[PDB]
């Protein structure tokens, strides 16, 4: 489990469930090559995106479809999406948790990186 | 300003208007002594709390009545209030902005501290 | 497990380990009566603070000793502590996770409340 | 301002000074067209990006070079940048402040949107 995404809802005080998440790797022509995707579970989590062997050093983008989430809840959002862009494994393979906290007009994102 | 408080509403993307703010300073006997109070303006700011002279070294507490703000909008929020507790002017006078960003079940707070 | 506290470090990108956490209940004379305490684990979590039967409706305060944490890391902090004050169980017993994300001059706190 | 960007440093409790910001607008063929750029001032603000006339309806992207900011301070941060993507002026002209609060392994961003 090298990469996990966790999404929380600051309005309802709950996991953000059924949020679409797309993961991309930066290709050698600086285009984003899509890589993995899924929807958050009932606990707001998305596991199983990639494997140790596949998740090589590179620049990755995680795109979280916040706008659809807020629309599904009948709440007007500001952002198209929340994007998180980071270089992976620069000092060795790590386990990455990308956590995002969502409000309609704000979001925060944090990485929890462990050995 | 020696002390300013700024409050934003993360649901609406707006200043949080008419939010009550109470400031306290810790006394020599460790109680909380009322220091100043006010409410946020149309810009979500509260100015004029104190003066450089009055704002001496000490531990201050800023209590933002976030509950009453959300209740007035129909929302039953998680938090009773947002409180920010800090030592001020330990290395000489500084200007403090206390910013809070409010959601029903979350808040964040940040300090910007500048040397005049 | 009616009440859990989770603390993350935004500087290091890690759980906040060995952070002291005190929990209080508001007494009938409006004083804070201390109630439970502990230190966060290696995963930044604190479990086992209270039981279903004990965690009755009331106003609770969770005080997280951020200042000691930052001092232990040799980083100058702004806040004395992060406090979270909330009324519990107003519509029935819930499971409460209090999550805090720490930076030296900022913190955020969110509640994840589930049935 | 039709568009202002404000950046704060959560480690130091200060404005984030000299942070590069690039703004893009999505074209009719779905590419990202350069729109404006600048760097934050001593107050951590960037003004003068656009004008009411130029800032028409569309999807905009604000990319804040947070990596270079942290690297200059000796820190290897998590994020390459902070990017904020949003539809602007969908219901008529509005004033947008995009605020970002930066930590090495975290950032938050908020929009304050006002009607002149």
Curated annotation (Swiss-Prot), chains B, D:
Outcome reported for the amino acid change (mutating residue 88 to G): In AMYLD1; amyloid polyneuropathy
Residues the record lists as Sulfocysteine modifications: 1
Disease the record associates with this protein: Amyloidosis, hereditary systemic 1: A form of hereditary systemic amyloidosis, a disorder characterized by amyloid deposition in multiple tissues resulting in a wide clinical spectrum. AMYLD1 is an autosomal dominant form due to transthyretin amyloid deposition. Protein fibrils can form in different tissues leading to amyloid polyneuropathies, amyloidotic cardiomyopathy, carpal tunnel syndrome, systemic senile amyloidosis. The disease includes leptomeningeal amyloidosis that is characterized by primary involvement of the central nervous system. Hyperthyroxinemia, dystransthyretinemic: A condition characterized by elevation of total and free thyroxine in healthy, euthyroid persons without detectable binding protein abnormalities.
Modified residues (Phosphoserine): 43
Result, substituting residue 36 to D: In AMYLD1; amyloid cardiomyopathy
Tissue expression from the record: Detected in serum and cerebrospinal fluid (at protein level). Highly expressed in choroid plexus epithelial cells. Detected in retina pigment epithelium and liver.
Result after altering residue 21 to M: In AMYLD1; amyloid polyneuropathy; by far the most frequent mutation
Mod. after translation: Not glycosylated under normal conditions. Following unfolding, caused for example by variant AMYLD1 'Gly-38', the cryptic Asn-89 site is exposed and glycosylated by STT3B-containing OST complex, leading to its degradation by the ER-associated degradation (ERAD) pathway. Sulfonation of the reactive cysteine Cys-1 enhances the stability of the native conformation of TTR, avoiding misassembly of the protein leading to amyloid formation.
Protein name: Transthyretin
Positions spanned in the full protein: 30 to 145 of 147
Effect caused by changing residue 49 to R: In AMYLD1; amyloid polyneuropathy
Outcome of mutating residue 105 to C: In AMYLD1; amyloid polyneuropathy
Effect of mutating residue 24 to V: In AMYLD1; amyloid polyneuropathy
Family: Belongs to the transthyretin family.
Origin species: Homo sapiens (Human)
